């Protein structure tokens, strides 16, 4: 499952997390098994005009 997130909410992607995207957009199971990979894509996923 792949997507893009605002920089600061990166630690909202964890089991039993509370936030804005953690509960309104994507919720992980409490007993999730697997891995999470996060990296920056500023040079492509950002625009000077936004």
């Amino acid at each position: 499952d792949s997507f893009v997130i605002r920089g600061d909410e990166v630690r909202q992607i964890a089991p039993g997390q509370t936030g804005n995207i953690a509960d309104y957009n994507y919720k992980l199971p409490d007993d999730f098994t697997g891995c999470v990979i996060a990296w920056n894509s500023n040079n492509l996923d950002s625009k000077v005009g936004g």
């Binding site: 089991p15 039993g16 997390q17 509370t18 409490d30």
Partner: protein
Amino acid sequence: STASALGKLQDVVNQNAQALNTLVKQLSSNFGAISSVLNDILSRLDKVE
């Protein structure tokens, strides 16, 4: 007239009562938790912790 002649039965009853009472009282202990009430520690806290 003379009391205290029935020490054995009174002792048995008192022992049972004390054991039950201390078992009940053990609920109020903290055991290293933050509180002895489940509802409050549930409400003030979050899920994974």
